[PDB]
PDB file of all heavy atoms in Angstrom:
ATOM      1  N   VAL B  31     -26.111 -32.460 -84.294  1.00  0.00           N
ATOM      2  CA  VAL B  31     -26.169 -32.813 -82.875  1.00  0.00           C
ATOM      3  C   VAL B  31     -25.911 -34.298 -82.703  1.00  0.00           C
ATOM      4  O   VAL B  31     -25.072 -34.713 -81.894  1.00  0.00           O
ATOM      5  CB  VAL B  31     -27.525 -32.408 -82.279  1.00  0.00           C
ATOM      6  CG1 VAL B  31     -27.621 -32.892 -80.816  1.00  0.00           C
ATOM      7  CG2 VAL B  31     -27.725 -30.877 -82.329  1.00  0.00           C
ATOM      8  N   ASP B  32     -26.625 -35.128 -83.477  1.00  0.00           N
ATOM      9  CA  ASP B  32     -26.472 -36.577 -83.333  1.00  0.00           C
ATOM     10  C   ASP B  32     -25.062 -37.014 -83.676  1.00  0.00           C
ATOM     11  O   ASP B  32     -24.489 -37.888 -83.009  1.00  0.00           O
ATOM     12  CB  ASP B  32     -27.449 -37.334 -84.249  1.00  0.00           C
ATOM     13  CG  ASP B  32     -28.881 -37.291 -83.776  1.00  0.00           C
ATOM     14  OD1 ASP B  32     -29.125 -36.922 -82.612  1.00  0.00           O
ATOM     15  OD2 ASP B  32     -29.770 -37.616 -84.597  1.00  0.00           O
ATOM     16  N   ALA B  33     -24.503 -36.470 -84.755  1.00  0.00           N
ATOM     17  CA  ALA B  33     -23.254 -37.003 -85.273  1.00  0.00           C
ATOM     18  C   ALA B  33     -22.040 -36.571 -84.459  1.00  0.00           C
ATOM     19  O   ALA B  33     -21.089 -37.345 -84.318  1.00  0.00           O
ATOM     20  CB  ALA B  33     -23.104 -36.590 -86.745  1.00  0.00           C
ATOM     21  N   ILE B  34     -21.984 -35.328 -83.995  1.00  0.00           N
ATOM     22  CA  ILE B  34     -20.791 -34.827 -83.325  1.00  0.00           C
ATOM     23  C   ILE B  34     -21.079 -34.279 -81.941  1.00  0.00           C
ATOM     24  O   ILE B  34     -20.135 -33.875 -81.244  1.00  0.00           O
ATOM     25  CB  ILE B  34     -20.003 -33.814 -84.170  1.00  0.00           C
ATOM     26  CG1 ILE B  34     -20.745 -32.480 -84.281  1.00  0.00           C
ATOM     27  CG2 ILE B  34     -19.701 -34.407 -85.557  1.00  0.00           C
ATOM     28  CD1 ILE B  34     -19.977 -31.398 -85.078  1.00  0.00           C
ATOM     29  N   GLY B  35     -22.352 -34.209 -81.535  1.00  0.00           N
ATOM     30  CA  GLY B  35     -22.654 -33.850 -80.159  1.00  0.00           C
ATOM     31  C   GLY B  35     -22.529 -32.389 -79.852  1.00  0.00           C
ATOM     32  O   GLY B  35     -22.470 -32.009 -78.682  1.00  0.00           O
ATOM     33  N   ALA B  36     -22.495 -31.534 -80.863  1.00  0.00           N
ATOM     34  CA  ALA B  36     -22.548 -30.107 -80.575  1.00  0.00           C
ATOM     35  C   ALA B  36     -23.942 -29.759 -80.058  1.00  0.00           C
ATOM     36  O   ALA B  36     -24.932 -30.285 -80.558  1.00  0.00           O
ATOM     37  CB  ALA B  36     -22.281 -29.302 -81.855  1.00  0.00           C
ATOM     38  N   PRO B  37     -24.065 -28.843 -79.109  1.00  0.00           N
ATOM     39  CA  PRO B  37     -25.407 -28.421 -78.698  1.00  0.00           C
ATOM     40  C   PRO B  37     -26.136 -27.749 -79.853  1.00  0.00           C
ATOM     41  O   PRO B  37     -25.546 -27.005 -80.638  1.00  0.00           O
ATOM     42  CB  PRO B  37     -25.148 -27.436 -77.555  1.00  0.00           C
ATOM     43  CG  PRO B  37     -23.724 -27.123 -77.578  1.00  0.00           C
ATOM     44  CD  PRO B  37     -22.993 -28.170 -78.357  1.00  0.00           C
ATOM     45  N   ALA B  38     -27.435 -28.015 -79.973  1.00  0.00           N
ATOM     46  CA  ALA B  38     -28.203 -27.459 -81.082  1.00  0.00           C
ATOM     47  C   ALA B  38     -28.057 -25.943 -81.185  1.00  0.00           C
ATOM     48  O   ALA B  38     -27.975 -25.393 -82.288  1.00  0.00           O
ATOM     49  CB  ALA B  38     -29.676 -27.839 -80.915  1.00  0.00           C
ATOM     50  N   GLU B  39     -27.998 -25.245 -80.050  1.00  0.00           N
ATOM     51  CA  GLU B  39     -27.921 -23.790 -80.054  1.00  0.00           C
ATOM     52  C   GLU B  39     -26.597 -23.273 -80.604  1.00  0.00           C
ATOM     53  O   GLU B  39     -26.452 -22.060 -80.790  1.00  0.00           O
ATOM     54  CB  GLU B  39     -28.180 -23.297 -78.615  1.00  0.00           C
ATOM     55  CG  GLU B  39     -29.515 -23.795 -78.041  1.00  0.00           C
ATOM     56  CD  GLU B  39     -29.395 -25.109 -77.257  1.00  0.00           C
ATOM     57  OE1 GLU B  39     -28.369 -25.823 -77.391  1.00  0.00           O
ATOM     58  OE2 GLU B  39     -30.361 -25.451 -76.524  1.00  0.00           O
ATOM     59  N   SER B  40     -25.630 -24.153 -80.838  1.00  0.00           N
ATOM     60  CA  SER B  40     -24.374 -23.755 -81.456  1.00  0.00           C
ATOM     61  C   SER B  40     -24.359 -24.000 -82.962  1.00  0.00           C
ATOM     62  O   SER B  40     -23.359 -23.685 -83.604  1.00  0.00           O
ATOM     63  CB  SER B  40     -23.195 -24.484 -80.809  1.00  0.00           C
ATOM     64  OG  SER B  40     -23.132 -25.846 -81.186  1.00  0.00           O
ATOM     65  N   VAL B  41     -25.413 -24.587 -83.526  1.00  0.00           N
ATOM     66  CA  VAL B  41     -25.433 -24.968 -84.942  1.00  0.00           C
ATOM     67  C   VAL B  41     -26.124 -23.895 -85.761  1.00  0.00           C
ATOM     68  O   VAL B  41     -27.316 -23.603 -85.551  1.00  0.00           O
ATOM     69  CB  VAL B  41     -26.104 -26.328 -85.143  1.00  0.00           C
ATOM     70  CG1 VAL B  41     -26.104 -26.696 -86.618  1.00  0.00           C
ATOM     71  CG2 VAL B  41     -25.409 -27.402 -84.259  1.00  0.00           C
ATOM     72  N   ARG B  42     -25.361 -23.312 -86.687  1.00  0.00           N
ATOM     73  CA  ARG B  42     -25.863 -22.338 -87.651  1.00  0.00           C
ATOM     74  C   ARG B  42     -25.966 -23.000 -89.019  1.00  0.00           C
ATOM     75  O   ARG B  42     -25.011 -23.634 -89.494  1.00  0.00           O
ATOM     76  CB  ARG B  42     -24.910 -21.145 -87.713  1.00  0.00           C
ATOM     77  CG  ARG B  42     -24.911 -20.330 -86.415  1.00  0.00           C
ATOM     78  CD  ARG B  42     -23.699 -19.369 -86.262  1.00  0.00           C
ATOM     79  NE  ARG B  42     -23.909 -18.527 -85.073  1.00  0.00           N
ATOM     80  CZ  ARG B  42     -23.801 -18.949 -83.821  1.00  0.00           C
ATOM     81  NH1 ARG B  42     -23.375 -20.183 -83.555  1.00  0.00           N
ATOM     82  NH2 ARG B  42     -24.111 -18.126 -82.820  1.00  0.00           N
ATOM     83  N   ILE B  43     -27.118 -22.836 -89.656  1.00  0.00           N
ATOM     84  CA  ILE B  43     -27.343 -23.365 -91.012  1.00  0.00           C
ATOM     85  C   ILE B  43     -27.610 -22.196 -91.931  1.00  0.00           C
ATOM     86  O   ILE B  43     -28.555 -21.426 -91.711  1.00  0.00           O
ATOM     87  CB  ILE B  43     -28.521 -24.351 -91.085  1.00  0.00           C
ATOM     88  CG1 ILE B  43     -28.451 -25.461 -90.020  1.00  0.00           C
ATOM     89  CG2 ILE B  43     -28.630 -24.929 -92.493  1.00  0.00           C
ATOM     90  CD1 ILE B  43     -27.333 -26.429 -90.215  1.00  0.00           C
ATOM     91  N   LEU B  44     -26.826 -22.092 -92.998  1.00  0.00           N
ATOM     92  CA  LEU B  44     -26.906 -20.954 -93.912  1.00  0.00           C
ATOM     93  C   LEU B  44     -27.169 -21.495 -95.309  1.00  0.00           C
ATOM     94  O   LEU B  44     -26.277 -22.086 -95.924  1.00  0.00           O
ATOM     95  CB  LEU B  44     -25.595 -20.168 -93.884  1.00  0.00           C
ATOM     96  CG  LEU B  44     -25.118 -19.718 -92.487  1.00  0.00           C
ATOM     97  CD1 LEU B  44     -23.870 -18.860 -92.563  1.00  0.00           C
ATOM     98  CD2 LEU B  44     -26.221 -18.960 -91.775  1.00  0.00           C
ATOM     99  N   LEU B  45     -28.367 -21.285 -95.823  1.00  0.00           N
ATOM    100  CA  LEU B  45     -28.714 -21.819 -97.142  1.00  0.00           C
ATOM    101  C   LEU B  45     -28.447 -20.758 -98.211  1.00  0.00           C
ATOM    102  O   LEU B  45     -28.995 -19.641 -98.142  1.00  0.00           O
ATOM    103  CB  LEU B  45     -30.191 -22.222 -97.215  1.00  0.00           C
ATOM    104  CG  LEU B  45     -30.702 -23.151 -96.113  1.00  0.00           C
ATOM    105  CD1 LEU B  45     -32.202 -23.473 -96.415  1.00  0.00           C
ATOM    106  CD2 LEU B  45     -29.881 -24.399 -95.974  1.00  0.00           C
TER     107      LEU B  45
END
Side-chain angles (χ1 to χ4, degrees):
Chain B
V31 175
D32 287 345
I34 71 178
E39 304 92 344
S40 73
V41 180
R42 292 164 173 73
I43 310 292
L44 306 184
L45 308 182

